[PDB]
Amino acid sequence: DWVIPPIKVSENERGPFPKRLVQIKSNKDRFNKVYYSITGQGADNPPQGVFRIEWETGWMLVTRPLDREEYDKYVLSSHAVSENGSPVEEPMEITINVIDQNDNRPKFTQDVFRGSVREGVQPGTQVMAVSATDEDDNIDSLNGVLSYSILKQDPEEPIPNLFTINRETGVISLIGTGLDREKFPEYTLTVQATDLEGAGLSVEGKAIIQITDANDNAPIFDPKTYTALVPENEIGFEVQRLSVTDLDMPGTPAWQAVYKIRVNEGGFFNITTDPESNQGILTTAKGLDFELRKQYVLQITVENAEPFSVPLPTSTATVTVTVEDVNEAPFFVPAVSRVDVSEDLSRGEKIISLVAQDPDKQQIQKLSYFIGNDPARWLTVNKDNGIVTGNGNLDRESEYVKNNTYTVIMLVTDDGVSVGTGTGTLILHVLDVNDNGPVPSPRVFTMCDQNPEPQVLTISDADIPPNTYPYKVSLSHGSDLTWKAELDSKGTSMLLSPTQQLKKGDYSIYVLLSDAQNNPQLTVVNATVCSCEGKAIKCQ
Amino acid sequence: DWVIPPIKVSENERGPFPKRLVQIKSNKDRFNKVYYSITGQGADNPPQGVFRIEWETGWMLVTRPLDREEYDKYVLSSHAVSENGSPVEEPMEITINVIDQNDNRPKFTQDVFRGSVREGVQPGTQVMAVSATDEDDNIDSLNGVLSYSILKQDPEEPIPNLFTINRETGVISLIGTGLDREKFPEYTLTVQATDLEGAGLSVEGKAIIQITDANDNAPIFDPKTYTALVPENEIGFEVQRLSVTDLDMPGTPAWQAVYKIRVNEGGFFNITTDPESNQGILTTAKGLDFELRKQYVLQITVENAEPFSVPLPTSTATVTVTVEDVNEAPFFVPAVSRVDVSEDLSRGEKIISLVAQDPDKQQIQKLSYFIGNDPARWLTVNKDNGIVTGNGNLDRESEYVKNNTYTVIMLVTDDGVSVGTGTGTLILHVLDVNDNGPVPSPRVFTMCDQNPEPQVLTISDADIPPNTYPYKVSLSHGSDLTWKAELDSKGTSMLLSPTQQLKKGDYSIYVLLSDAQNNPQLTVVNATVCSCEGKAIKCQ
Amino acid sequence: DWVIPPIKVSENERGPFPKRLVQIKSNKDRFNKVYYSITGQGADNPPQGVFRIEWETGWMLVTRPLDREEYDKYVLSSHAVSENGSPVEEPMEITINVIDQNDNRPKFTQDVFRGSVREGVQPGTQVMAVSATDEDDNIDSLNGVLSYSILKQDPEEPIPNLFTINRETGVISLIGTGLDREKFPEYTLTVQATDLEGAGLSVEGKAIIQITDANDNAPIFDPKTYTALVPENEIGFEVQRLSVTDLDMPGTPAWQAVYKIRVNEGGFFNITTDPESNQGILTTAKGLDFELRKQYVLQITVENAEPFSVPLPTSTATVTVTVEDVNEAPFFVPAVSRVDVSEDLSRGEKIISLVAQDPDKQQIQKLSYFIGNDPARWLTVNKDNGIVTGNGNLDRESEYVKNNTYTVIMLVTDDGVSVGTGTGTLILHVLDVNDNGPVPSPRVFTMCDQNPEPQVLTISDADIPPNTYPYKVSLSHGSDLTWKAELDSKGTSMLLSPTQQLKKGDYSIYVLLSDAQNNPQLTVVNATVCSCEGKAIKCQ
Ligand SMILES: *[C@@H]1O[C@H](CO)[C@@H](O)[C@H](O)[C@H]1NC(C)=O
Ligand SMILES: *[C@@H]1O[C@H](CO)[C@@H](O)[C@H](O)[C@H]1NC(C)=O
Ligand SMILES: *[C@@H]1O[C@H](CO)[C@@H](O)[C@H](O)[C@H]1NC(C)=O
Ligand SMILES: *[C@@H]1O[C@H](CO)[C@@H](O)[C@H](O)[C@H]1NC(C)=O
Ligand SMILES: *[C@@H]1O[C@H](CO)[C@@H](O)[C@H](O)[C@H]1NC(C)=O
Ligand SMILES: *[C@@H]1O[C@H](CO)[C@@H](O)[C@H](O)[C@H]1NC(C)=O
Ligand SMILES: *[C@@H]1O[C@H](CO)[C@@H](O)[C@H](O)[C@H]1NC(C)=O
Ligand SMILES: *[C@@H]1O[C@H](CO)[C@@H](O)[C@H](O)[C@H]1NC(C)=O
Ligand SMILES: *[C@@H]1O[C@H](CO)[C@@H](O)[C@H](O)[C@H]1NC(C)=O
Ligand SMILES: *[C@@H]1O[C@H](CO)[C@@H](O)[C@H](O)[C@H]1NC(C)=O
Ligand SMILES: *[C@@H]1O[C@H](CO)[C@@H](O)[C@H](O)[C@H]1NC(C)=O
Ligand SMILES: *[C@@H]1O[C@H](CO)[C@@H](O)[C@H](O)[C@H]1NC(C)=O
Ligand SMILES: *[C@@H]1O[C@H](CO)[C@@H](O)[C@H](O)[C@H]1NC(C)=O
Ligand SMILES: *[C@@H]1O[C@H](CO)[C@@H](O)[C@H](O)[C@H]1NC(C)=O
Ligand SMILES: *[C@@H]1O[C@H](CO)[C@@H](O)[C@H](O)[C@H]1NC(C)=O
Ligand SMILES: *[C@@H]1O[C@H](CO)[C@@H](O)[C@H](O)[C@H]1NC(C)=O
Ligand SMILES: *[C@@H]1O[C@H](CO)[C@@H](O)[C@H](O)[C@H]1NC(C)=O
Ligand SMILES: *[C@@H]1O[C@H](CO)[C@@H](O)[C@H](O)[C@H]1NC(C)=O
Ligand SMILES: *[C@@H]1O[C@H](CO)[C@@H](O)[C@H](O)[C@H]1NC(C)=O
Ligand SMILES: *[C@@H]1O[C@H](CO)[C@@H](O)[C@H](O)[C@H]1NC(C)=O
Ligand SMILES: *[C@@H]1O[C@H](CO)[C@@H](O)[C@H](O)[C@H]1NC(C)=O
Ligand SMILES: *[C@H]1O[C@H](CO)[C@@H](O)[C@H](O)[C@H]1NC(C)=O
Ligand SMILES: *[C@H]1O[C@H](CO)[C@@H](O)[C@H](O)[C@H]1NC(C)=O
Ligand SMILES: *[C@H]1O[C@H](CO)[C@@H](O)[C@H](O)[C@H]1NC(C)=O
Ligand SMILES: *[C@H]1O[C@H](CO)[C@@H](O)[C@H](O)[C@H]1NC(C)=O
Ligand SMILES: *[C@H]1O[C@H](CO)[C@@H](O)[C@H](O)[C@H]1NC(C)=O
Ligand SMILES: *[C@H]1O[C@H](CO)[C@@H](O)[C@H](O)[C@H]1NC(C)=O
Ligand SMILES: *[C@H]1O[C@H](CO)[C@@H](O)[C@H](O)[C@H]1NC(C)=O
Ligand SMILES: *[C@H]1O[C@H](CO)[C@@H](O)[C@H](O)[C@H]1NC(C)=O
Ligand SMILES: *[C@H]1O[C@H](CO)[C@@H](O)[C@H](O)[C@H]1NC(C)=O
Ligand SMILES: [Ca+2]
Ligand SMILES: [Ca+2]
Ligand SMILES: [Ca+2]
Ligand SMILES: [Ca+2]
Ligand SMILES: [Ca+2]
Ligand SMILES: [Ca+2]
Ligand SMILES: [Ca+2]
Ligand SMILES: [Ca+2]
């Protein structure tokens, strides 16, 4: 058909109501009276009564103002019946479009936006982002397009133009330079959005930016030069602690100190760090020792764990140390294999005039010499002059003496001012003299009767050679009660044989030898005889 | 075609709206999309929006509740066009019928109906008529048919069921008996009408009935026996008035009294009625008279103008009258032609001893007798004894006496106690005596000279016969100066003639007559003579 | 709805254009002016402008002629808008069907169809098949149904009604009889197809049929009787070749000849066939031989490889052969163990008068007898009379003679007219004569001195028994130089013993024996003696 165009109507209209929109006519009215009515939402349906028609003229009206924001369009159905009561025309659809008007102010997405950036970054860096909206049209008008802006950053210091915002997108960026968490950490700037691309109505928001941290700062010592005293030897011990103040953020690696000495003399120092006021705690690496050095001039520089965000001054601490003195024990010089001395020494004679030395050249402390180790008592010392003399009777020949030795240990004490011990061994070579003289091996025989065979006997000397070289056998009172002497060819033994057919048991034979001579006297080597033929038998 | 049935819908429907009625489909939809719309009253025409269709499904709906009472039917036209824009199917008529529901209470034609009936009527008599209506259907349901009834007549007295009403027609009739305007004249009864032949809903009205009047009552006298006094004679006059009280309606013929005496003695009484308290006003018909009766016992009954609507007691009034006395004039008995008396009566003699009578036997009142009528003075009366004597000289012979009469009238007066007159005539026969005597007719002649002829002369008597019978003529001194006497044969005249030739004029002749005798003397009848021959001539 | 029926329109319509089809009206025109338009293919869409409507009346028209063959149907959409500009009725679909008309001539599937069948088949046999089409309707009309037919087969010979075609299917079949590839191998017939079942329009095609082959023909010889000459013996050799002509198809088994002789005399003939003009090549099976037969009358029939498609005449070839002569070598009759002849024969005496025979009775050819084999020269032949005489000295006794034999072979030659050899052996029984006489075995002794034991000696004869029967020993000059003779009992040896004690070595003994007598003289059997006792010892 020839339909009927949609009807545009403005919003928030205002004048004298009613307002005729249009007029409709059924031509089938030649016959009876026609009754015009109309139906739909806004008509008889909810919102009832916005539009109504004059049953007799065919006029359509808007009865009151409208807000497209509420309902932006309506569709209606129109009718025409006869007085008799019958419909005449197939109904007719009707449309109305509600044209937008700038009745709406915009509104920010949130009531407050927050942001953060680091202090050391470069100009032209994107920080935050902000939103807002207008409910009016924005597809055929500007009643709903906004334009963003900024008008007041607080801390109007260092300067007041650190940022800008993209008018269309509302994004903010760092424009200037001079950000420092250490002086001004959080800005509060006021934003506004406007109707018709900055032309219409405006509103406010608030965005707040916190500033991350940077290693803008270096560490600073609170003393620059310290001093402490120290002892030579127990040690590995705490000398002095140090103080400092970095200014970036505390629990952070831009706040933790790292040290080191420049030069470690004997490399006898270690230094650690501590999460207190991360003071510098210095200590001794390997004890000290001395009388060698009293002075210690060393320097320690301090850094952070992480590198610096800028060239900065490295700052050292210069420190002086002094070693207190402890006084140590003295010592005999050697451990003496000294005196190759003979057995004939006169009880009270100079053996070893000895001396001991003591470390501490503070030496105005003497000591006393004491002896100590010990198989039995011979020797003697002058305690205030360390003089070892030889008292007593010695005898290389016999008991304690093991290999050609006699080892003895002695002491010495550090007095004068405190304490001390000195353990020193002393081996002294004893010597030989020909003391003893020759002696027979077996002392009792068992001779036989009829024809006894030679009674083997031998010789032994306690002395050391030559002193036991060859012999000379001799038979004293009974050199004839019949007894005849004899030597083995290979030196050592002697052959003892009677020369008479003598008696039934129990009787001695006086013996007498010599080796350089010395002559011993020996003696009786008794002789038990019991009935027989010729071989030395078990007796009775 | 295969059309589409009308759609019945209930009224005052109620549930969740919408409500699908039916669904339509164009089959010509194989080609494009079809758009369903619909038109008419209730559609796009006033009432707009009661029904609407889903352009894409083809469903028809009722959008809200309806009242058949407002619109009981709708007719609609349905359409289907293509997206391109062309119609596909010849439209389609659609009908909806709205089924009635009992939403309407009935209502009385008027707010109050009035009525009236007469008190004496019979049970089974139609009085009033009442109306009312219901607007719901009444041609397929009972939602609109009523049933009439009554539930409270006021004046629940004599009894409380004087009427009934026809449930279907609403007409009322008298059912009981005992209606009396005189005690309870106006009832007020409450009526009700109901839905579904007395089943549904009900309402009230009010009908008020006034009761016409009836001659239920008879008239009642307020005195039952009266008395009054009365006078004999002026009369036709008011004796006494009477009082009564009928009880029906005042200005009415059931309240106007009618009387009558039972027996009218001499028929000398009349009685009228009067629109005052319609008292009985009695009077005298024809004066009374008396000394004949003093008592009057008569009775008067009283009715109404119109007959009675019931047998009733007729009630009489018994009354007594007494006649006062007035005293009347006396009367001579007759009117007397009494005394044939002669002329010779002696002055002072009994003529008529008369008497008069007076009516009132209360008679202790005398009177006095006076005379009255009159030619001249003769007679006389004794006033305290009525005695007529005769004084004076009378004389039948002459003047007043006309025929043989003399009539006289006299009076008498009622004294003793008040007043009176009595006119009575009296004729008295006078009589004859022979008084006078004879006399000559002519007294002067004219005789002649030479030979005079007889001078005729005659005779006359004043008396009555026999007293004038025949004569005897006589001539006294001059019985001869010549004169000679003579009588006519037929008695009366006399012939006078000289006997000498005598002289010239002037001279008399002495005459003398008689009749019983009496003898008169008459006289001189002079005679004038003058010169002549013989005939009585005129003289000189 | 009340839609609107499709509109049938004829094709290739022709009269005055335009042509009103139908008129449409919107009734919603009571209000404004309505504008009628219409859309679709054939409307505003390609083919644009075939139909158009009068915006103000509502008439629809066809503007020009149509061909259903191009487009057989159209669908359109109609519209109606108001002057103000609004559509009034949902558009309306519109349809038009284009009714077919016989505007199309049919057409053959191919431009030429080919076919083939074999000559000997039976009437009522399906050969080819042909197609064609019409584009007009063929489902409600006959505008597209064809009827097939034939109207000219070429080679209107033998007869001109060899086939028919099924009018509905277009299939062709053999109806007549007389097909021969050999005379008329390929027919060319003209076909036609027609509209409305042979009623409408027609067209032509061409179908060509080739005729397969059949064994209608038998083989025919070109000579009927041949002749050839032949030789007796080298042989297995080609006698004569034969010619023939079958008429069916060449490279085919209905053209390959197969032979055979009827009777094979000694079964000495073979005959093969050859893919040349498949001539009959006859040969000799097993040489011939003769002088036995000169004539050969034999017959050979010829067939094809595959049987015949009809009874036919088998045709033989009758042939005559003649054997040329070759002349062979002669032969002695036997191989002779003939002459039991004695050693005493006189040099030049009849031994074996022999004869030889020669085959060829053409015998006017003689030969010459030559001898040949040979240990040495005795015998002799007359060459022109074959006479074996005996020249020479023979001697059964000794050298060549092995068992009692002497075998010799000789020859004979075929001359007179050509060549020849005859090898014949000849064994001749030689006989015994007593030639030689007895002789001693050892000829030299070794006798001893003191007492020599008998010198054993024996005897031997070269003759055959009785001729060597027993002996007679004799001692000639020295029958006493002392020597005494003796025979062994069992005949053969002789005991030689002295009778004197004679001398020291070197000396003979004259011996003399006999066997029939013959007497030999023998001789000296010398005797070497050397010093001794009695046993024949080794000497010196
Ligand atoms: C930003 O926020 C802080 C915290 O309240 C406030 O003190 C300051 O004034 C605001 N503006 C700037 C530029 O710091
Ligand atoms: C020396 O060392 C001491 C240690 O107690 C310290 O207090 C002082 O500051 C250092 N410097 C000097 C000059 O004494
Ligand atoms: C670190 O020490 C320096 C030296 O006096 C001082 O100026 C600074 O304030 C200290 N740091 C802090 C956080 O006080
Ligand atoms: C530390 O060493 C420096 C370097 O010589 C010296 O001046 C100072 O006296 C030493 N000790 C103290 C107490 O500073
Ligand atoms: C000597 O030295 C040895 C080795 O230690 C020791 O065992 C011994 O007791 C010391 N004295 C003597 C008398 O040997
Ligand atoms: C010296 O050392 C000795 C070791 O034998 C020890 O017993 C003693 O206590 C020390 N003397 C002093 C004075 O400290
Ligand atoms: C020295 O004396 C000390 C203290 O008893 C002891 O421990 C040590 O063994 C002794 N000997 C030496 C050689 O120092
Ligand atoms: C009827 O109407 C009268 C007048 O008001 C009223 O007094 C009376 O109570 C009513 N009912 C009857 C039965 O009289
Ligand atoms: C008598 O008549 C008089 C007239 O005045 C009246 O008042 C009275 O009621 C009557 N009856 C009697 C007994 O007096
Ligand atoms: C009429 O008179 C009688 C007699 O006393 C009385 O009972 C009645 O009430 C009177 N009528 C009227 C209306 O008073
Ligand atoms: C009326 O007449 C009656 C009848 O005799 C009598 O009783 C009465 O006294 C008369 N007068 C009066 C005053 O009632
Ligand atoms: C007599 O009576 C008559 C008749 O009425 C009257 O005219 C006359 O005057 C009376 N007297 C005399 C004397 O006649
Ligand atoms: C009597 O009647 C006479 C009539 O002649 C009249 O004049 C007079 O007044 C009456 N007398 C009395 C006393 O009433
Ligand atoms: C009686 O006297 C009266 C009073 O004057 C008078 O009227 C009447 O005529 C007189 N006559 C008679 C006859 O009563
Ligand atoms: C069939 O085709 C052959 C080959 O061209 C032609 O010669 C002949 O005339 C045609 N017709 C018949 C019946 O052979
Ligand atoms: C005979 O054989 C010869 C062979 O060369 C042949 O040519 C000939 O046709 C055959 N027939 C006769 C009758 O010669
Ligand atoms: C075969 O030989 C016969 C005999 O003459 C002849 O008629 C026929 O034509 C020959 N075949 C052919 C193909 O020439
Ligand atoms: C072939 O044999 C027949 C049969 O006898 C004979 O007639 C003929 O001569 C022979 N040879 C030839 C040359 O045909
Ligand atoms: C005899 O015949 C034999 C047998 O073949 C042969 O070996 C020999 O040479 C012939 N001649 C003689 C003399 O034996
Ligand atoms: C005959 O046969 C012999 C065989 O010994 C042969 O050497 C010779 O050549 C033949 N002779 C002839 C004439 O062919
Ligand atoms: C005959 O002579 C022929 C020709 O040399 C030879 O081959 C054959 O061996 C001879 N012998 C016989 C028995 O034929
Ligand atoms: C000082 O030395 C440190 C390392 O110990 C270095 O990191 C720092 O950058 C140096 N100072 C300067 C100004 O380069
Ligand atoms: C004493 O000192 C010596 C060093 O000469 C050492 O060898 C020995 O072990 C020490 N003996 C003791 C017990 O100290
Ligand atoms: C004695 O001397 C030997 C040789 O020097 C030495 O090795 C040994 O230790 C000493 N003492 C003993 C008990 O062997
Ligand atoms: C009494 O008399 C009257 C007429 O005077 C009459 O109408 C009435 O009915 C009578 N009373 C009775 C009870 O009949
Ligand atoms: C007097 O009374 C008489 C009755 O006798 C009457 O005829 C006459 O008229 C009366 N005259 C007068 C004047 O009353
Ligand atoms: C006298 O008498 C006559 C006769 O009775 C009478 O009729 C007449 O009235 C009287 N008087 C007169 C004047 O006639
Ligand atoms: C002649 O013989 C052949 C076979 O050699 C045979 O196939 C053919 O049918 C025969 N001829 C007739 C007429 O049967
Ligand atoms: C000769 O012929 C004979 C037949 O008797 C045969 O046995 C022999 O082999 C032949 N010898 C030779 C060499 O031909
Ligand atoms: C001789 O005769 C024997 C017996 O018949 C025969 O078998 C043999 O072959 C002949 N020759 C020889 C050498 O044996
Ligand atoms: Ca900073
Ligand atoms: Ca010693
Ligand atoms: Ca209702
Ligand atoms: Ca009453
Ligand atoms: Ca008188
Ligand atoms: Ca066609
Ligand atoms: Ca054929
Ligand atoms: Ca011989």
| DSSP output for C152-182 | EESS--S-S-SEEE-TTT-EEEE-S---BTT
Residue C224, ligand 17, Cβ within 6 A: no
Burial class (CB in 10 A: 0-12, 13-18, 19+), B157: exposed
Residues in chain B: 540
| Residue A199, C-beta contacts closer than 8 angstroms, at least 6 positions apart | A142, A147
By the 8 A CB rule, do A271 and A239 touch?
no
By the 8 A CB rule, do A423 and A335 touch?
no
Q: SS3 for B30?
A: helix
Of the candidates A434, A423, A406, A397, which has an alpha carbon nearest to the alpha carbon of residue A514? Answer: A434
Q: Are the beta carbons of B77 and A85 separated by less than 8 Å? A: no
Burial class (CB in 10 A: 0-12, 13-18, 19+), B89: buried
Q: Which element (helix H / strand E) includes C197?
A: helix C195-198
> Which of C1, C25, C26, C28 has the highest number of chain A CBs within 10 A, making it the mutation to test binding with A?
C28
| Residue A465, C-beta contacts closer than 8 angstroms, at least 6 positions apart | none
By the 8 A CB rule, do A408 and A426 touch?
yes
The partner residues of C320 in beta bridges, in order of sequence, read C227, C297
Judge if A331-427 and A436-540 fold alike in CATH terms.
yes
What is the distance between the alpha carbons of residues C521 and C436, in angstroms, rounded to a whole number? 11
Q: SS3 for A36?
A: strand
Distances (CA, A) of C205 to C116, C135, C163: 17, 18, 16
What is the distance between the alpha carbons of residues B379 and B367, in angstroms, rounded to a whole number? 20
Chains that touch B (3 or more CB pairs under 8 A): A, C
CATH number of C434-540: 2.60.40.60
Burial class (CB in 10 A: 0-12, 13-18, 19+), C232: middle
Residue C359, ligand 15, Cβ within 6 A: no
Residue A423, ligand 7, Cβ within 6 A: yes
Q: How many CB atoms lie within 10 A of CB C89?
A: 27
Alpha-helical segments (H) within B129-281? 195-198
| Residue A153, C-beta contacts closer than 8 angstroms, at least 6 positions apart | A160, A161, A162, A163, A187, A188, A189, A190
Of the candidates A432, A460, A450, which has an alpha carbon nearest to the alpha carbon of residue A501? Answer: A450
User: Which one of B222, B224, B227, B321 would you pick to mutate in the ligand 9 pocket, going by the greatest count of ligand atoms within 8 A of its CB?
Assistant: B227
Q: SS3 for A198?
A: helix
CATH number of B7-99: 2.60.40.60
Q: Are the beta carbons of B43 and A93 separated by less than 8 Å? A: no
For residue A247, give the amino acid letter: L
Q: Which element (helix H / strand E) includes C195?
A: helix C195-198
Chain A residues touching residue B64 (CB < 8 angstroms): 44
| Residue B241, C-beta contacts closer than 8 angstroms, at least 6 positions apart | B279, B280, B281, B282
Burial class (CB in 10 A: 0-12, 13-18, 19+), B406: buried
For residue C340, give the amino acid letter: D
The partner residues of C19 in beta bridges, in order of sequence, read C62
Residues in chain C: 540
DSSP line for C123-155? SSEEEEE--EE--S--SSSSTT--EEEEEEESS
Specify the residue for token string 């003089």: A387
CATH number of C331-427: 2.60.40.60
Chain C residues touching residue B92 (CB < 8 angstroms): 1
CATH number of C225-324: 2.60.40.60
**DSSP-assigned letter for residue B196:** H
- Phi then psi for residue B230, to 5 deg, are -155, 155
For residue A196, give the amino acid letter: L
Q: SS3 for C347?
A: coil
Whole-number Å distance, alpha carbon C416 to ligand 29 midpoint, is 26
Regarding beta strands C225-231 and C317-324, do their DSSP bridges make them parallel or antiparallel, or are they unpaired?
parallel
Residue B313, ligand 25, Cβ within 6 A: yes
- Phi then psi for residue A530, to 5 deg, are -150, 140
What is the distance between the alpha carbons of residues A291 and C342, in angstroms, rounded to a whole number? 167
Q: ∠ at Cα B174 (B168, B179), nearest 5°? A: 155
What is the distance between the alpha carbons of residues C418 and C398, in angstroms, rounded to a whole number? 43
By the 8 A CB rule, do A347 and A435 touch?
no
| Residue B217, C-beta contacts closer than 8 angstroms, at least 6 positions apart | B182, B246, B247, B248, B254, B312
The partner residues of A456 in beta bridges, in order of sequence, read A495
Chain B residues touching residue C87 (CB < 8 angstroms): 81, 85
CB hemisphere CA count around B286 (13 angstroms): 5
- Phi then psi for residue A29, to 5 deg, are -90, 0
CA distance A141 to chain C (A): 26
What is the distance between the alpha carbons of residues C451 and C435, in angstroms, rounded to a whole number? 39
Residues of A with CB under 8 A from a CB of B: 1, 3, 34-40, 43-45, 53, 55, 76-81, 85-94
Alpha-helical segments (H) within A150-277? 195-198
The partner residues of B331 in beta bridges, in order of sequence, read B357
Distances (CA, A) of C211 to A533, C16, C191: 166, 60, 19
Structure tokens at B470: 């025949």
What is the distance between the alpha carbons of residues C69 and C81, in angstroms, rounded to a whole number? 36
**DSSP-assigned letter for residue C412:** E
Of the candidates C17, C5, C143, C142, which has an alpha carbon nearest to the alpha carbon of residue C69? Answer: C143
Q: Which element (helix H / strand E) includes B405?
A: none
Q: ∠ at Cα C114 (C112, C117), nearest 5°? A: 160
Q: ∠ at Cα C361 (C359, C362), nearest 5°? A: 120
Burial C350-385 (b: 16+ CB within 10 A, else e): ebbebebebbbeeeeeebbbebeeeeeebbbbeeee
Number of H helices, E strands in chain B: 1, 40
Regarding beta strands C92-99 and C7-10, do their DSSP bridges make them parallel or antiparallel, or are they unpaired?
parallel
What is the distance between the alpha carbons of residues A77 and A41, in angstroms, rounded to a whole number? 10
Cis peptide, bond prior to residue B498, ω within 30 of zero:
no
What is the distance between the alpha carbons of residues A424 and A331, in angstroms, rounded to a whole number? 8
Q: Are the beta carbons of A79 and B46 separated by less than 8 Å? A: yes
Burial C119-151 (b: 16+ CB within 10 A, else e): bbeeeeeebbebebebebbeeeebbbbbbbbbe
For ligand 34, an ion, list residues with CB under 5 A. B 180, 182, 216
What is the distance between the alpha carbons of residues B23 and A143, in angstroms, rounded to a whole number? 44
Specify the residue for token string 């209502």: B107
Considering only the C-alpha atoms of chain B, give the largest distance between any 2 of them, rounded to a whole number of Å. Answer: 207
What is the distance between the alpha carbons of residues A168 and A423, in angstroms, rounded to a whole number? 96
By the 8 A CB rule, do B272 and B260 touch?
no
What is the distance between the alpha carbons of residues B173 and B163, in angstroms, rounded to a whole number? 6
Residue C423, ligand 21, Cβ within 6 A: yes
By the 8 A CB rule, do B261 and B321 touch?
no
Nearest ligand, CA of residue B98?
33
Whole-number Å distance, alpha carbon B467 to ligand 35 midpoint, is 9
Instruction: Give the CATH architecture of domain B435-540.
Output: Sandwich (2.60)
Burial B236-264 (b: 16+ CB within 10 A, else e): eeebbebebebebbeeeebbbbebebeee
Residue C409, ligand 29, Cβ within 6 A: yes
Chain pair A-B, CB pairs under 8 angstroms: 129
**DSSP-assigned letter for residue C27:** S
What is the distance between the alpha carbons of residues A191 and A151, in angstroms, rounded to a whole number? 6
Q: Which residue of C has its CA nearest to A30?
A: C30
Residues of A with CB under 8 A from a CB of C: 1-5, 24-28, 89-90, 92
CATH topology of domain B107-212: Immunoglobulin-like (2.60.40)
Please tell me which of the candidates B26, B31, B32 has its beta carbon nearest to residue C1.
B26
- Phi then psi for residue A231, to 5 deg, are -100, 140
Query: What resolution in angstroms does the PDB record give?
Result: 30.0
User: Which one of A186, A191, A210 would you pick to mutate in the ligand 1 pocket, going by the greatest count of ligand atoms within 8 A of its CB?
Assistant: A186
Ordered by start, the domain boundaries in chain C are 7-99, 107-212, 225-324, 331-427, 434-540
Residue C175, ligand 18, Cβ within 6 A: no
What is the distance between the alpha carbons of residues C76 and B32, in angstroms, rounded to a whole number? 11
Q: Are the beta carbons of A1 and C31 separated by less than 8 Å? A: no
By the 8 A CB rule, do B254 and B246 touch?
yes
Residues of B with CB under 8 A from a CB of C: 26, 28, 31-32, 34-35, 37, 79-92
Residue A277, ligand 3, Cβ within 6 A: no
CATH number of A436-540: 2.60.40.60
Burial C56-76 (b: 16+ CB within 10 A, else e): eebbbebeeebebbeeeebeb
Chain pair B-C, CB pairs under 8 angstroms: 72
Whole-number Å distance, alpha carbon B170 to ligand 8 midpoint, is 21
For residue B357, give the amino acid letter: Q
Please tell me which of the candidates B41, B63, B81 has its beta carbon nearest to residue A87.
B41
Whole-number Å distance, alpha carbon C194 to ligand 36 midpoint, is 15
The terminus-to-terminus CA distance of chain C in angstroms comes to: 175
By the 8 A CB rule, do A536 and A523 touch?
no
Please tell me which of the candidates B44, B47, B85 has its beta carbon nearest to residue A78.
B44
By the 8 A CB rule, do C424 and C335 touch?
yes
Q: SS3 for C198?
A: helix
By the 8 A CB rule, do C202 and C193 touch?
yes
How was this entry determined? Answer: cryo-EM
Atom number in ligand 25 closest to CA B312: 13
Distances (CA, A) of A387 to A354, A368, A384, A390, B31: 6, 11, 8, 10, 144
Q: Are the beta carbons of B40 and A81 separated by less than 8 Å? A: yes
Of the candidates A487, A479, A484, which has an alpha carbon nearest to the alpha carbon of residue A515? Answer: A487
Q: How many CB atoms lie within 10 A of CB A480?
A: 10
CA distance A81 to chain C (A): 15
What is the distance between the alpha carbons of residues B447 and C17, in angstroms, rounded to a whole number? 192
**How far, rounded to the nearest angstrom, does the alpha carbon of residue B230 sit from its chain's CA centroid?**
25
What is the distance between the alpha carbons of residues A367 and A386, in angstroms, rounded to a whole number? 10
The partner residues of A299 in beta bridges, in order of sequence, read A318
What is the distance between the alpha carbons of residues B146 and B170, in angstroms, rounded to a whole number? 9
